[PDB]
Design an enzyme around this catalytic site. Structure first.
Site, PDB file in Angstrom:
ATOM      1  CG  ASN A 140      36.332  54.655  35.706  1.00  0.00           C
ATOM      2  OD1 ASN A 140      35.574  55.376  36.365  1.00  0.00           O
ATOM      3  ND2 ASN A 140      36.401  53.327  35.856  1.00  0.00           N
ATOM      4  CD  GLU A 168      34.544  50.463  37.848  1.00  0.00           C
ATOM      5  OE1 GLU A 168      34.995  49.598  38.625  1.00  0.00           O
ATOM      6  OE2 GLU A 168      35.121  50.765  36.769  1.00  0.00           O
ATOM      7  CD  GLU A 199      41.345  49.942  37.808  1.00  0.00           C
ATOM      8  OE1 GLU A 199      42.276  49.106  37.939  1.00  0.00           O
ATOM      9  OE2 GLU A 199      40.135  49.652  37.985  1.00  0.00           O
ATOM     10  CG  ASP A 202      31.405  47.585  44.837  1.00  0.00           C
ATOM     11  OD1 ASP A 202      32.392  48.199  45.339  1.00  0.00           O
ATOM     12  OD2 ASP A 202      31.534  46.724  43.929  1.00  0.00           O
ATOM     13  CG  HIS A 206      35.194  49.469  43.462  1.00  0.00           C
ATOM     14  ND1 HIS A 206      34.038  48.735  43.278  1.00  0.00           N
ATOM     15  CD2 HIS A 206      35.700  49.699  42.224  1.00  0.00           C
ATOM     16  CE1 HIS A 206      33.875  48.496  41.984  1.00  0.00           C
ATOM     17  NE2 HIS A 206      34.866  49.078  41.323  1.00  0.00           N
TER      18      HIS A 206
HETATM   19  O1  LIG Z   1      37.802  44.746  40.301  1.00  0.00           O
HETATM   20  C1  LIG Z   1      36.557  45.456  40.336  1.00  0.00           C
HETATM   21  C2  LIG Z   1      36.474  46.490  39.183  1.00  0.00           C
HETATM   22  C3  LIG Z   1      37.588  47.539  39.364  1.00  0.00           C
HETATM   23  N1  LIG Z   1      37.431  48.637  38.357  1.00  0.00           N
HETATM   24  C4  LIG Z   1      37.399  48.171  36.955  1.00  0.00           C
HETATM   25  C5  LIG Z   1      36.351  47.055  36.763  1.00  0.00           C
HETATM   26  O2  LIG Z   1      36.526  46.543  35.443  1.00  0.00           O
HETATM   27  C6  LIG Z   1      36.549  45.895  37.752  1.00  0.00           C
HETATM   28  O3  LIG Z   1      35.546  44.892  37.396  1.00  0.00           O
HETATM   29  C7  LIG Z   1      35.997  43.549  37.626  1.00  0.00           C
HETATM   30  O4  LIG Z   1      36.919  43.246  36.610  1.00  0.00           O
HETATM   31  C8  LIG Z   1      37.481  41.926  36.849  1.00  0.00           C
HETATM   32  C9  LIG Z   1      38.596  41.780  35.790  1.00  0.00           C
HETATM   33  O5  LIG Z   1      38.094  42.045  34.483  1.00  0.00           O
HETATM   34  C10 LIG Z   1      36.356  40.882  36.732  1.00  0.00           C
HETATM   35  O6  LIG Z   1      36.856  39.583  37.128  1.00  0.00           O
HETATM   36  C11 LIG Z   1      35.145  41.237  37.607  1.00  0.00           C
HETATM   37  O7  LIG Z   1      34.041  40.413  37.226  1.00  0.00           O
HETATM   38  C12 LIG Z   1      34.751  42.707  37.429  1.00  0.00           C
HETATM   39  O8  LIG Z   1      33.740  43.148  38.378  1.00  0.00           O
END
Ligand SMILES: OC[C@H]1CNC[C@@H](O)[C@@H]1O[C@@H]1O[C@H](CO)[C@@H](O)[C@H](O)[C@H]1O
Length: 314
Positions: free
Chosen positions: A169, A233, A127, A235, A205
């Site tokens: 990513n 990722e 990101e 969804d 996402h």
């Molecule tokens: O916020 C959704 C995802 C966005 N892309 C990067 C991923 O690491 C993210 O996963 C979420 O990260 C959050 C912070 O670490 C955590 O609270 C959630 O459980 C993850 O799904």
């Protein structure tokens, strides 16, 4: 094929999930994990907060649990994520200049070394870009180190792990837009200059009914830079509760995404960001949204399941 694993295996591609190692003690969750996927990524266990809670003091138990799970079940292991602005420990936020750069470098080095020969690919940087183009504007890395931190991270990761696939990513980069153009410019630059970089992750996402129609074209232009691509990722969230119309659209959406990957030879596969709606990140971030995954909160297969199977060509 009678499982998604079989469909992906048959297609010569990866179908992965984001694992919470604590949920392995829930037998239904483990049963689906074991049987429906051929790749695993740690949802949280390999992030900086989870691995380096104080400076140069590492906590690899949770990440090791994910790695051991992959090895025990014969799944590819995908690494997430060495450098990300979110959830960075306060100790790291409190550092500046060369001290902060050295903490980043040490983090990359120690985590990549620890998992060397287990993790096959890393999200080295996550990101980095901004919706609307250019660099992210609320990042400790961008603010303290400037443009060069991405290259520094990739070179450090390759120095630690000579063979892992090193990926960048991002999200909202699935279509051709200012954000994915900025990402594209970097990838082309890195390859032109021989900066270690092997792959690009497209988080995907998405919102039900809103899959970018140019997703395949976009994946292809990245692959044509000489890198692999991956949906990392996936969804597809809706306003809850679900109903027949929304579930059908969501299934069609899953099929669109998996097909876009199937249509690009260097698309390694698709990883979904969880197994069950029961545990999805979505409802906590977007109130009144959710039902974004392939299994519902009671572990029933949703219409998305058949769609994914069909898309992999099963
Ligand atoms: O916020 C959704 C995802 C966005 N892309 C990067 C991923 O690491 C993210 O996963 C979420 O990260 C959050 C912070 O670490 C955590 O609270 C959630 O459980 C993850 O799904």
């Amino acid at each position: 094929a009678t499982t998604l694993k079989e469909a992906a295996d048959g297609a010569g591609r990866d179908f992965g999930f984001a694992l919470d190692p604590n949920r392995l003690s829930e037998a239904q969750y483990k049963a689906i994990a074991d049987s429906e996927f051929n790749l695993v990524v740690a949802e949280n266990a390999m992030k900086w907060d989870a691995t380096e809670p104080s400076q140069n003091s590492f906590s690899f138990g949770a990440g090791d649990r994910v790695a051991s799970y992959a090895a025990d079940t014969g799944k590819e292991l995908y690494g997430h994520t060495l450098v990300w602005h979110s959830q960075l420990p306060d100790w790291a936020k409190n550092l500046n200049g060369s001290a902060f750069e050295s903490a980043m470098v040490n983090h990359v080095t120690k985590v990549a070394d620890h998992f060397e020969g287990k993790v096959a690919s890393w999200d080295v940087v996550n990101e980095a870009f901004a919706d609307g183009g250019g660099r992210r504007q609320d990042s400790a890395f961008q603010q303290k180190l400037g443009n060069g931190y991405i290259e520094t991270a990739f070179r450090a990761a390759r120095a630690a792990d000579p063979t892992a696939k090193l990926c960048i990513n991002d999200y909202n980069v699935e279509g051709i837009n200012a954000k994915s153009n900025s990402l594209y410019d970097l990838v082309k630059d890195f390859k032109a200059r021989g900066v270690p970089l092997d792959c690009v992750g497209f988080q995907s996402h998405l919102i039900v009914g809103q899959v970018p129609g140019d997703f395949r074209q976009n994946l292809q232009r990245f692959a044509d830079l000489g890198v692999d691509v991956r949906i990392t990722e996936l969804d597809i969230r809706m306003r809850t509760p679900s109903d027949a119309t929304k579930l059908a659209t969501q299934a069609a959406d899953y099929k669109k995404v998996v097909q876009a990957c199937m249509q690009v030879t260097r698309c390694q596969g698709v990883t979904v960001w969880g197994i069950t709606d029961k545990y999805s990140w979505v409802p906590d971030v977007f109130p009144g949204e959710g039902a974004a995954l392939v299994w519902d909160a009671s572990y029933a297969k949703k219409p998305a399941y058949a769609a994914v199977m069909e898309a992999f060509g099963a």
